[PDB]
Amino acid sequence: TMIGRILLTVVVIFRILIVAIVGETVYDDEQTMFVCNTLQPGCNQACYDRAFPISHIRYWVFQIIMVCTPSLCFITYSVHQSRFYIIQVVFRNALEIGFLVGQYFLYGFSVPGLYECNRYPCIKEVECYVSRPTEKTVFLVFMFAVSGICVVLNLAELNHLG
Amino acid sequence: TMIGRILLTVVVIFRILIVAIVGETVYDDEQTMFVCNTLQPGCNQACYDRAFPISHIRYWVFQIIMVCTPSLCFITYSVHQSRFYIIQVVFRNALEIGFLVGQYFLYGFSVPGLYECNRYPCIKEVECYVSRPTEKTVFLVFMFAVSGICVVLNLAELNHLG
Amino acid sequence: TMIGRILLTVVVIFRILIVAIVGETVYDDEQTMFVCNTLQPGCNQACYDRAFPISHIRYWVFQIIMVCTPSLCFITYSVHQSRFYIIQVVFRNALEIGFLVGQYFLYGFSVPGLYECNRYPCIKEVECYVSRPTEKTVFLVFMFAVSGICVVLNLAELNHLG
Amino acid sequence: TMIGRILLTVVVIFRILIVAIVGETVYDDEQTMFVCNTLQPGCNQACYDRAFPISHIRYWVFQIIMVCTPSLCFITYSVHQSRFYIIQVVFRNALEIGFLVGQYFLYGFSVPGLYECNRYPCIKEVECYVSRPTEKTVFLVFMFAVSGICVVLNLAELNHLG
Amino acid sequence: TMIGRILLTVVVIFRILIVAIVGETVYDDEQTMFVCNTLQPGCNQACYDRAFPISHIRYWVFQIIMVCTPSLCFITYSVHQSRFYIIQVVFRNALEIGFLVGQYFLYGFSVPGLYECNRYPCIKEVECYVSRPTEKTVFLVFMFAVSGICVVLNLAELNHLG
Amino acid sequence: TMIGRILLTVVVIFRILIVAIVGETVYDDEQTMFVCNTLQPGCNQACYDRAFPISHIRYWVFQIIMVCTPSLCFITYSVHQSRFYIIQVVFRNALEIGFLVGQYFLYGFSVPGLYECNRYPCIKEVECYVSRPTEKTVFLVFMFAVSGICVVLNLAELNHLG
Amino acid sequence: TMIGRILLTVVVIFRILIVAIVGETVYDDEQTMFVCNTLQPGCNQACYDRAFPISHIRYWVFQIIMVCTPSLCFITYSVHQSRFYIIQVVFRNALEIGFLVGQYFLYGFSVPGLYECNRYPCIKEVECYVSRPTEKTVFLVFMFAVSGICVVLNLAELNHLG
Amino acid sequence: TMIGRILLTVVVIFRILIVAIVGETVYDDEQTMFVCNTLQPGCNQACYDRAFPISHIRYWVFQIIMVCTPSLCFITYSVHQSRFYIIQVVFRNALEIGFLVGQYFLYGFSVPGLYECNRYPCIKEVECYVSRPTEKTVFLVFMFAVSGICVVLNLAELNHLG
Amino acid sequence: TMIGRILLTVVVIFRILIVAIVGETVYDDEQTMFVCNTLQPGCNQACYDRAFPISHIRYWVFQIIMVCTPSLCFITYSVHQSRFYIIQVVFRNALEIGFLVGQYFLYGFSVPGLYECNRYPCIKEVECYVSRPTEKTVFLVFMFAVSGICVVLNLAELNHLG
Amino acid sequence: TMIGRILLTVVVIFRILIVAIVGETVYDDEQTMFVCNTLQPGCNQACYDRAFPISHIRYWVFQIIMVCTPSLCFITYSVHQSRFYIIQVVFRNALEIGFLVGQYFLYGFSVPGLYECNRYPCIKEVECYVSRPTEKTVFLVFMFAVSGICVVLNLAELNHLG
Amino acid sequence: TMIGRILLTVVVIFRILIVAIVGETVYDDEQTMFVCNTLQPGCNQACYDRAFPISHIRYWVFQIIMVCTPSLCFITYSVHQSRFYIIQVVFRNALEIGFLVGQYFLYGFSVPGLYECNRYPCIKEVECYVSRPTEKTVFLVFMFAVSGICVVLNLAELNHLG
Amino acid sequence: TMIGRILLTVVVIFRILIVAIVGETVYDDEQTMFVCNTLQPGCNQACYDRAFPISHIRYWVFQIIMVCTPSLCFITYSVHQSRFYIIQVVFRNALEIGFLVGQYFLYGFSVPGLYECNRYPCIKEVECYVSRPTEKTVFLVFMFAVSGICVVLNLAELNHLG
């Protein structure tokens, strides 16, 4: 139970570093290199918006910021100065399970190279083509693995205290 | 009444972080990906200007900066060194209610994908198409929720002292 | 007379923050989205240069830097270490009135959406179209209001000492 | 055995500096200057994705971050406060050998100027042309040499203690 | 003679701030908005290179860095620890007069809007058009004025000691 | 022999500052403004790669970093704590002579405005045109002069101790 | 009544010559120089078809051919060989009055330079521009005048016989 | 029965004149003004070929030539020189009924303005737009009416002789 | 008076031949090579229509046909078969004087190379450029000379009979 | 045997009329509407030349002219004036069988819509698309049928005389 | 003197045939393939007009028609029916010498491939390129030779009669 | 010797028909489909002019017209009315041998698909691509064969008379 805290801290810092340093530049050209086979003005905008409603990197930044709020609350309380420890552990567990489930329900496990679109002003159905699908799939899988590790560790400690 | 201060501080910091880190890059391509169905030079400029007079991110930065002025005044006074506390609380309450009302009156609750324009030099009425409407709607709703929380908390403390 | 100093310091810091954080990005696309109805090479350059000789943001940065020089002089003198206080107050007053008058004479109170140009190599008179006129007008008015407040406060203190 | 530690530290810092300062800007135009001889929409995307599944710089950043985790664990343990030293040395050795082998299996020793592509929606086989192949080959060879040096040094110390 | 040092320090800092904060962004589009009336490939490159051999901002950065070297030498000497003071004053005077003369001989007092070019591969003489000439002329004049002030002050002190 | 160390330190810092602040922005448009007279897809890539195998700025950054390694080794040794001084001086001398010779053999003393290319897929020989040749020639000459000064000084001290 | 036949024959031949020699080349560019202010594919086709359902020259050729059929019938009868004369005169009168009335109801008296179109796939209403409107108006008026003359003459002879 | 021959001859000559003089120029731009909403090379060719397999004017020329062959045979026989009259009348009747039926089965009674296409290399279904549909519909109806008249007359004479 | 008839016949035939053989091909590209300096759709059509309301060649064909009508009337009368001779001579004289006067009032004596246009949808005044002005001026002058000769001859004969 | 000559003459005239009146305008756009999926200059020319070495209409005109030479020889002989009749019949038979066989060996029975090309300067194999394949197939089949009829008739008469 | 008339008639007919059959199609693309190195609208029109004021083929048609007028006069006289023969011979001689001299003074003996133009709206001097110069030079020389032959023959006969 | 005249007449008429009916339309697109791999304005004109100085069809028309002049002379002589027969036969023989030799020396026996050009304004050597080379080669060979036949026949008759 001693090493579990050390590894939780290391996993958290590793995740923050990976997201902060490289993720902002895989997605930089997401819409500029999205293209559809069509001559209709406005079809690219509608089809990109329907294929990618919220970008992965925004979701990950939001999750990272939201999973650090109980610590800030505890720190502010202690600065003003055991039950608080229990409650914040419970809240962190709940938040991390919710975020992992939401990731699975929003994105799945892969990013395909083709997309079929039928939104106005596009006439009937059109075919569109995605940028960098393999790298984005790799990123998806890596983030899922890290978040799973964190969930396991927090449940470990929750059950250790009981 | 003890936790209310802690949560107000946490909400303020959370809002600042969310605005500072991600909001500058959803709106980056706002005008470059705005397009209208027309062959008239200058119509895109006029229609973009009429559809989006002040961008959301400018309004939010201004609001964030303006709601922190009473604290700076109090700090400068104390550095030079109860009535001041009362007055600054009143002013903060008023400013935050004004900004929330102004947000509601300026933008509403959604960003549509189509816009109908009838400004010179456009001939009669033309149709234009917006970039990333869903993400911008999500951002709008999130910011409204946070500001509502802050209003509630400040009224709480105002009525607590009385 | 006590609060006047506090509010002058707060106004100065507020102005610096507003100029530094957001103003660099309203004007970023000033020339790339300026367009004229013409087929003559070189007409866009001449008409943009005649319409906007010095950009607003350059003038504001220069003014902000120049109104802080008497303080730097006083600080350097004191570091090396009442008449100096008097003289620097006088100089600050003069500089701020000069800059406000110059702003009024250079730009006025609005930025129009159309511009009429008659400069070589343009044949006769041509019509050109501006980017983001409403936001720029709002910025103009806000900056004028802040500078007026600062002028009033400095005259207040000048007349207080006498 | 005294100098070996000094040179390991120097090699690590040298590698970090080289990757951090210059590598982000050789690869900046990787996809914008990739071009294929074709008139089919979407062929450039598919052929670029098949030729470069994971960019070199992403792999190198990931490797650099992952080879510094045992040190962070040891530091966190000591902050909380010989077997740990042994175990972390073993783990570092294993990680660095794995990463070097993976580099060899993923990329080889050269980047060619031409690429032959046969992925949908491209009709039959098409020819594509790469940007900056010589500089990228030089970078590949340099990184392999540095990582080899590091492997040798860590095996040296492992066998020194035994 | 007391105030002369204070004003020299203030002028130096003012010049550094003006060059560092704004000058990098007037010249950003220098070549992208340079255009010539021609259909010959390569003529724009040759004519831009002949019209602007060294950009103003490079010259000013170089001058600013080179006029601060005697101070660094004196500081390093004193850290290791009157004749040195004399010699460094002489050297600074010489360097600043040389740089002002070189500026006058390289650029003059204005930037014109048209340029006439006769370099290969351009056929006979062609006409080209410059970006932002008025702002660049204003910058030229301002920098000349500041450097003149600095020259006057340094000669003042040189003759004061004698 | 006293001043020689001071001037060596000043030259090193001057070189680092010049390379770090301005050199990254002369070369920014190196490939985007390279153009050849041809209609063949892929010829620009091959001819640019053959004309500029390694960019000047990469070579200079690498050289600057590599000539500071003996100092880092000596510092790490002393932190752990005359022969080391001797050896590191010898190594620095050798490295700086090698880098100067390599510069001369790689680039020479000028950058021409035209380039003649005969690489596949270009048909026979084609003519291409370079961006900013004069500024790049000036930079080449300046860097050679500085490195020569450094070589002279290090040989001076080597022969002083003997 | 003697000259009436001579002038009828001369008018008929004059009309045939004018239609046959020049009319085919005023209308040659009717659709190639028709243009609408729009970016929608297919709008030009629909708007041209709605503005000009049957071209003038087709109608005039058809009318000219149809008003010569009674003569051909009479000639064929006589070749095979007073009541027939009467009947054919009646039929010619009726046909020429019908054709003049139809011309008035189909085309009117002018061809305007602008046209307002609201047909699918055009979005809302668009503005289109016509080629050579003045010449076509002149042709319309001339043809109406000639046909009126012919009607008058044929009624003259009809009433002469009775 | 006397006039029937005269009117048959007149109808035949009228049809020949109408087809020969004007029909070649309604269809002249048939493929050059056919356009589809797509970016796929080769789709316009396939969709035009599927929409219009044999052009109307070719069919009409062929029919006109083929319905005059029995007369040529009879003329050649008589030049070499009642049963032949009978047989040629029968054959003409059969040929004209066959051609009218074939017209009805090939083309129908209208030409629509839109066409829906699903032929390779077009992806799924695309929409295409036709040139001059109303004029072509008018021509179709006129030709059907004339051919009906001719059929009626030939049956009349066939039944007259019996 | 004998030769006058011979020369009138020769002049008439010469004029007909010159108009019929070459004039149709100087004017063929009249609108396709007409160009204006503008980006407004529809401006070329309006400005061409205002500059050239009726083309020269149409006017000349009409005049040639109309001056031969009295001869056709006289021929038809004589075929059916001195006062008629007198009347037709008078009518021919009147028609030829009217046509010459109309030519002078419609076109003048030259065709300029530039045209200044101020018709909707053109914004203010624009400059347009004409095709083949010198050849058209030569043609104008030649036709005026020939028509003058014909007028003189017909007046000669009119006064000869009296 | 009497009717055989009449039908041979009718078939010959029918074939000449069909070829002369319509065939020149199906093939008019043969190369202008031929397109290949490629960016290589010169590939369209080579692939069109390899797909269609001799156009159908040229072959048919040549055949028609060459099968009428024996008649011209016989006519010229008789004008100068039974064995000649025999010889010319034999020659006509041979020529018509040769031309039919050559048609079968050159073109076959269909024109496909796609063509696969591998000629320099095209890189590897490319796909090209044909204009009006169905109409051209119909024309091929019709011409084969007519020529077969003619062959049968000429063999008939040859065997009739013996 | 007998053969001279025969050869004059043959030369005249040969010249007419050569001009009528082929000359109309060398000059067909005269302005469409004329191109200048410039970006100025309207420069091509002015430079083409200045380089080719009257096209060769127009001059040759005019000359051919004008040298046949004396024959028409003589024919008309004889139809109405030695001195006339004399006078018409004199006139033909004069006309043919005048036309040959005018050709020499208008065009010379060659058509160059380059043209240097300095007409408004072209800026300074521009270079333009001609279509088919060699064929046009050959045509010039051939026409001069034929006209010389005709002049010689007519002088021959003039001096023969005396 | 009887049939030789008949076959000469037939060959002459056959050649005239083949040249007149089809040859004008193989060469119609000769320059419009000529293309070179270059970006230099004016290079296509110079290279086309150097590759094809005189077009085949012009040479063939000229030859056909010139080989019929002796017949016209003989006809004109006889109309005015054995040695003349002899002389004209000799002249025809000479002319036909000269024209065949000139054809061989001007064009050879094939038309290649590629052409290598080195004429100003083209830089060094460029590659260009020809239209319809195979058809043009076939035409060349056919014309050579026919002219050879004619030469043989005329020599036959020349030697027959002696």
Q: Transcribe L112-147 into DSSP letters.
A: -SEEEE--TTS-S-EEEE-S-HHHHHHHHHHHHHHH
Q: What is the DSSP string of C83-129?
A: HHHHHHHHHHHHHHHHHHHHHHHHHTT---SEEEE--TTS-S-EEEE
How many beta-carbon contacts under 8 Å exist across G and H?
55
Query: What does the alpha-carbon distance between residue C112 and residue C129 come to, in Å, rounded to a whole number?
Result: 9
State the count of interchain CB pairs (< 8 A) between B and C.
54
Tokens of residue A23, six digits: 């993720």
Coil, strand or helix: which one is I125? coil
**Cβ burial, residue G77 (10 Å; 0-12/13-18/19+):** middle
Interface list for chain L against chain K, based on CB atoms closer than 8 Å: 31, 41-42, 45-46, 49, 53-55, 58, 61-62, 65, 69, 72-73, 76-77, 80, 121
Q: Strand D126-129's sheet: what is its strand order?
A: D35-36, D126-129, D114-117
CA dist., res. I43 & res. I47, Å (int): 6
Give the count of beta carbons closer than 10 Å to the beta carbon of residue B145.
Answer: 9
Selecting from C55, C58, C73 the residue whose C-beta is nearest the C-beta of E6 gives: C73
Query: Residue F37 CA to chain centroid, in angstroms?
Result: 30
Where does residue H72 fall: left (phi above 0), alpha (psi -120 to 50 degrees), or beta otherwise?
A: alpha
> Distances in Å between the alpha carbon of H113 and those of A40, H129, H131?
19, 6, 7
Query: Which positions in chain L touch J54 (Cβ < 8 Å)?
Result: 134-135, 138
Under an 8 A CB cutoff, do G41 and A39 touch? yes
I159 dihedral zone (left: phi>0; alpha: psi -120 to 50; beta): alpha
Structure tokens at J108: 């076959």
Neighbours of H28 (CB within 10 A): 11
Q: By what method was this entry solved?
A: cryo-EM
Contact D41 H41 (CB under 8 A): no
CA distance A146 to A64: 12
In angstroms and rounded to an integer, the radius of gyration of the C-alpha atoms of chain K is 20
Helix (H, G, I), strand (E, B) or coil at G119: coil
Which of L53, L70, L47 has the alpha carbon at shortest distance from L120? L47
Cβ atoms of K56 and K92 within 8 Å: the answer is no
Q: Is the distance from CB of L52 to CB of L30 less than 8 angstroms?
A: yes
Instruction: Find out whether A22 and D61 touch, Cβ atoms under 8 Å.
Output: yes
Residue E22, C-beta contacts closer than 8 angstroms, at least 6 positions apart? C58, C61, C62
Cα–Cα distance measured from residue E124 to residue E120, given in angstroms and rounded to the nearest whole number: 9
Q: Is D42 left (phi over 0), alpha (psi -120 to 50) or beta?
A: left
Q: For residue I158, count CB atoms less than 10 angstroms from its CB and return exposed for 0-12, middle for 13-18, buried for 19 or more.
A: middle
Nearest residue, CB atoms, I127 vs list C37, C123, C127 = C123
In sequence order, which residues have a C-beta less than 8 Å from that of residue G101 and are 6 or more positions away? none
- From I18's Cα to the closest Cα of chain G, the distance in A is 16
CB-CB contact of C51 with C115 (8 Å): yes
Is F39 exposed, middle or buried, given 0-12, 13-18 or 19+ CB atoms closer than 10 A?
Answer: middle
Q: Cis omega before residue D112 (within 30°)? A: no
Measured CA to CA in angstroms, residue L9 lies from E121, J70, L5, L67, L88 at distances of 61, 13, 6, 13, 16
Please give the torsion angle defined by the CA atoms of residues I104, I106, I112 and I113, in that order, rounded to the nearest 10 degrees: -150
Contact partners, residue L73, CB within 8 Å, separation at least 6: K6, K7, K10, L88
Whole-number Å distance between alpha carbons of K117 and K53: 14
Q: Which residue has the tokens 């202008």?
A: J32
What tokens does A131 get? 């940028």
Residue A109 CB neighbours (<10 A)? 9
Of A105, F82, B119, D119, nearest to C114 (Cα)?
A: B119
Q: Which of E31, E54, E72 sits opposite F138 (nearest CB)?
A: E54
Radius of gyration of chain A (CA): 20
L42–K35: do the CB atoms touch at under 8 Å?
Answer: yes
* Residues with Cβ within 8 Å of residue C29, at least 6 apart in sequence: B31, C131, C132
What is the number of alpha carbons within 13 Å of residue G3 lying toward its C-beta?
A: 4
Contact between residue B112 and residue B133 where contact means Cβ atoms under 8 Å apart: yes
CA distance C42 to C22: 31
Residues followed by a gap in chain I, C→N > 2.5 Å: 81
Q: Is L29 strand, coil or helix?
A: coil
Helices (H) and strands (E) in chain J, counts: 7, 3
What is the least distance, in Å, from the CA of E135 to any CA of chain C?
A: 6
Selecting from G6, G13, G133 the residue whose C-beta is nearest the C-beta of I49 gives: G133
Q: How many CB atoms lie within 10 A of CB K29?
A: 13
- Residue reference for tokens 């409603």: A53
| Neighboring chains of E (3 or more beta-carbon pairs < 8 A) | C, F, K, L
Pure H helices in chain C: 2-21, 23-26, 43-51, 56-66, 69-80, 83-107, 133-161
Contact G45 H6 (CB under 8 A): no
| Cα→Cα distances B15→A96, B147, B150, I154, L27, Å | 20, 9, 10, 100, 75
Q: How many whole angstroms separate alpha carbon L116 and alpha carbon L51?
A: 9
Of A39, A40, A125, the CB nearest to H124: A125
From start to end of chain K, where are the E strands? Answer: 35-36, 114-117, 126-129
Least Cα distance to G72 among A83, A41, C159, H11 occurs for H11
| Nearest Cα residue to C126 out of C30, C46, C33, C27 | C46
User: Residue E113: helix, strand or coil by DSSP?
Assistant: coil
DSSP B90-144: HHHHHHHHHHHHHHHHHHTT---SEEEE--TTS-S-EEEE-S-HHHHHHHHHHHH
CA dihedral A64→A70→A71→A74, nearest 10 degrees, is: 170
Helix runs in chain F, H state only: 2-21, 23-26, 43-51, 56-66, 69-80, 83-107, 133-161
The number of CA neighbours under 13 Å toward the Cβ of I75 is 7
Report chain breaks in chain F, C–N > 2.5 Å, as residues after which they occur: 81
Contact (CB, 8 A) for G127 and I45: no
Are L31 and K35 inside 8 Å of each other by CB?
no
Integer Cα distance of L136 and L147 in angstroms: 17
Please list every residue in chain K whose beta carbon sits closer than 8 Å to the beta carbon of residue L72: 10, 13
Which chains does chain J touch, 3 or more C-beta pairs < 8 A? D, F, H, L
SS3 of residue C33 by DSSP: coil
- Residue D77: closest CA among I109, J102, B152, A4: A4
The conformation of residue G82, written as its DSSP 8-state character, comes to -
Here the tokens at position B31 are 């005008």
Q: Point out the residue among G53, G55, G65 whose CB comes nearest to the CB of H17.
A: G65
F126 phi and psi angles, rounded to 5 deg: -125, 160
Rounded to 5 degrees, φ, ψ at E119 are: -110, 140
Put simply, the answer to whether J124 touches D123 (Cβ < 8 Å) is no
Give resolution, Å, one decimal.
Answer: 2.7
Phi first, then psi: what are they for K126, rounded to 5°? -125, 160
Q: Shortest CB distance from A76 goes to which of B6, B133, B135?
A: B6
- Give the chain A residue whose CA is nearest to the CA of H35: A39
User: With contact defined as beta carbons under 8 Å apart, do A99 and A63 qualify?
Assistant: yes
Instruction: From chain C, pick out residues whose CB is under 8 angstroms from the CB of B53.
Output: 134-135
What is the identity of the amino acid at L31?
Q
Assess contact for D33 and F45: CB atoms under 8 A: yes
Three-class SS of residue E116?
A: strand
Buried b (16+ CB within 10 A) or exposed e, H113-144: bebebebebbbeebbbbbbbbebbbbbbeebb
Chains F and I touch (3+ CB pairs under 8 A): no
Q: Name the nearest CA neighbour of I35 among J120, D89, K40, J61.
A: K40
Whole-angstrom Cα distance, residue F7 to residue L97? 93
C-alpha–C-alpha distance, residues C155 and C157, integer Å: 5
d(CA D37, CA D43): 10
- If one counts every other C-beta atom within 10 angstroms of the C-beta of residue B132, the result is 24
Subunit contact G45:H113, Cβ cutoff 8 A: yes
Question: How far is it, in rounded angstroms, from Cα E162 to Cα G27?
Answer: 95
Task: Provide the 8-state DSSP code for J127.
Answer: E
**What separation in angstroms does the CA of G116 have from each of D96, G50, G120, G123?**
74, 10, 13, 12
Residue of D nearest to A127 (CA): D42
Cβ neighbours of F40 in J, within 8 Å: 41
CA closest to H40 among chain D residues: D40
Q: How many CB atoms lie within 10 A of CB J16?
A: 12
Nearest to A139 by CA among A130, A128, A147: A147
Cβ contact I65–G17 (<8 Å)? yes
Chains B and I form CB pairs within 8 A to the count of 4
Measure the CA–CA gap between E22 and L114, rounded to whole angstroms. Answer: 57
Which residue has 């027309």 as its token pair? B38
Angle formed at CA G106 by CA G55 and CA H133, multiple of 5 degrees: 45
**Half-sphere exposure of I12 toward its Cβ, with a 13 Å CA cutoff?**
18
Residues whose CB is less than 8 angstroms from the CB of residue C33 and which lie 6 or more positions away in sequence, other chains included: B31, B45, C131
Contact J41 F39 (CB under 8 A): yes
Task: Tell me the shortest Cα–Cα distance from J46 to chain L, in angstroms.
Answer: 8
Neighbours of J13 (CB within 10 A): 14
- Whole-angstrom distance, CA of residue C25 vs CA of residue E25: 12
Nearest to G100 by CA among G34, G32, G152: G152
Separation of first and last alpha carbons in chain F? 13
Rounded-to-integer distance, Cα H24 and Cα J22, Å: 10
Query: Helices I83-107 and I69-80 sit at what angle, rounded to 10 degrees?
Result: 160
Q: Which residue of J has its CA nearest to F40?
A: J40
**CA J102 to CA J66: how far, in whole Å?**
14
What gap in Å lies between CA B79 and CA C9, rounded to an integer? 13
Reference A143, options A84, A73, A75, A63; nearest CA is A63
Structure tokens at A22: 């490289």
- Verify whether the Cβ–Cβ distance H55 to J7 is below 8 Å: no
DSSP per residue over K76-118, as a string?
A: HHHHH--HHHHHHHHHHHHHHHHHHHHHHHHHTT---SEEEE-
Of B39, B40, B125, the CB nearest to G124: B125
Tokens of E138: 């204003």
Spell out which residues of chain L touch residue F124, defining contact as CB-CB under 8 Å: 124-125, 127
Alpha carbons L39 and B93: distance in angstroms, whole number:
68
Chain D residues touching residue A26 (CB < 8 angstroms): 58
Contacting residues for L98 by C-beta, under 8 A, at least 6 apart = none
Q: Which is nearest to G142 in space by CA: G13, G53, G6, G19?
A: G19
Q: Do C124 and I124 touch (CB under 8 A)?
A: yes
**J126-129 vs J35-36, strand pairing mode:** antiparallel
Q: With residue I127 as reference, give the H or E element that holds it.
A: strand I126-129
Largest CA-CA distance found in chain H, in angstroms, rounded: 66
Q: Which pair of structure tokens corresponds to residue D43?
A: 């062929």
Q: Is E46 exposed, middle or buried (0-12, 13-18, 19+ CB in 10 A)?
A: buried
What is the greatest pairwise CA distance in chain A? 66
Angle at the Cα of A123 from the Cα atoms of A122 and A126, rounded to 5 degrees: 70
Least Cα distance to L121 among L52, L30, L39, L53 occurs for: L39
Q: What is the DSSP letter of J114?
A: E
Answer for the pair G151, G100: CB distance below 8 angstroms, yes or no: yes
Interchain proximity K41–C41, CB inside 8 Å: no
List, in sequence order, every residue forming a beta bridge with C126; answer none if it has no partner: C117
- Paired tokens of L30: 């000769």
Name the β-bridge partners of B128: B36, B115
Q: Are A76 and A88 in contact (CB under 8 A)?
A: no
Tell how far CA D66 is from the center of its chain.
Answer: 12
- Output the CA torsion sign for F57, F63, F69, F70: negative
The burial of F132, by beta-carbon neighbours within 10 Å (0-12 exposed, 13-18 middle, 19 or more buried), is given as buried
Domains with residue ranges and CATH for chain A: 2-20+32-161 (1.20.1440.80)
Give how far Cα C110 sits from Cα of C29, C57, C107, E24, F146, Å: 19, 15, 8, 28, 53
D115 near D126, Cβ under 8 Å?
no
